[PDB]
Design an enzyme around this catalytic site. Sequence first.
Site, PDB file in Angstrom:
ATOM      1  CG  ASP A 178     -27.459 -43.232  10.613  1.00 18.10           C
ATOM      2  OD1 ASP A 178     -26.465 -42.793  11.214  1.00 18.10           O
ATOM      3  OD2 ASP A 178     -27.444 -43.581   9.419  1.00 18.10           O
TER       4      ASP A 178
ATOM      5  NE  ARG B 119     -25.391 -46.355  10.632  1.00 22.39           N
ATOM      6  CZ  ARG B 119     -26.438 -46.557   9.825  1.00 22.39           C
ATOM      7  NH1 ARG B 119     -27.643 -46.920  10.314  1.00 22.39           N
ATOM      8  NH2 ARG B 119     -26.253 -46.509   8.518  1.00 22.39           N
TER       9      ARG B 119
ATOM     10  CG  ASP C 123     -27.517 -44.901   5.114  1.00 22.79           C
ATOM     11  OD1 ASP C 123     -26.798 -44.529   6.027  1.00 22.79           O
ATOM     12  OD2 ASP C 123     -27.188 -44.733   3.958  1.00 22.79           O
ATOM     13  CB  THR C 124     -29.952 -40.592   8.417  1.00 23.02           C
ATOM     14  OG1 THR C 124     -28.854 -40.879   9.289  1.00 23.02           O
ATOM     15  CG2 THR C 124     -31.225 -41.056   9.083  1.00 23.02           C
TER      16      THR C 124
ATOM     17  CD  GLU D 171     -22.807 -39.941   6.923  1.00 19.65           C
ATOM     18  OE1 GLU D 171     -22.438 -39.458   8.017  1.00 19.65           O
ATOM     19  OE2 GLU D 171     -23.142 -41.145   6.763  1.00 19.65           O
TER      20      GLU D 171
ATOM     21  NE  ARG E 170     -21.197 -47.516  13.495  1.00 19.70           N
ATOM     22  CZ  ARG E 170     -21.574 -47.103  12.295  1.00 19.70           C
ATOM     23  NH1 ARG E 170     -21.755 -45.809  12.035  1.00 19.70           N
ATOM     24  NH2 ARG E 170     -21.812 -48.005  11.348  1.00 19.70           N
TER      25      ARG E 170
END
Length: 129
Positions: free
Chosen positions: A15, A29, A34-35, A37, A75
């Site tokens: 992401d 971002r 949300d991916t 980690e 970001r």
Amino acid sequence: LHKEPATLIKAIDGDTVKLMYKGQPMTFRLLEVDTPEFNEKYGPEASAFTKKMVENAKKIEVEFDKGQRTDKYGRGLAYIYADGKMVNEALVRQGLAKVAYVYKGNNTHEQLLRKAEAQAKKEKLNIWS
Ligand SMILES: Cc1cn([C@H]2C[C@H](OP(=O)(O)O)[C@@H](COP(=O)(O)O)O2)c(=O)[nH]c1=O
Ligand SMILES: [Ca+2]
């Protein structure tokens, strides 16, 4: 909202992506998702997914929402498109991301993304398996 050009500098993970925007390098971002980690379950698969989608794209575009354009880490916050397909949405649809971090300023595509999640979950994909 409108699309603006950008060019890939480098894939980072599910992401985040490094792009050139108005001729400046910037880590973006992905809004509203949300991916995991890379160190987590489906992290590698999320990374590979975004990476392939951004590296195979002829045309990368960025789309700011109505709110904040930069987060507290510097970001860029945007929806990122690869040849007209939204990466944000594509991750959710494959169960490689969750709808997340949906803040009032910056929620134009919330419903679209939640629709994609509801169908990933239906099909028991990846994260939802
Ligand atoms: C997606 C997004 C994340 N963030 C911030 C909130 C989180 O704060 P914290 O670092 O304090 O947890 C972090 C999540 O991003 P990551 O999933 O990349 O960590 O980035 C925003 O501020 N605005 C946004 O639109
Ligand atoms: Ca993440």
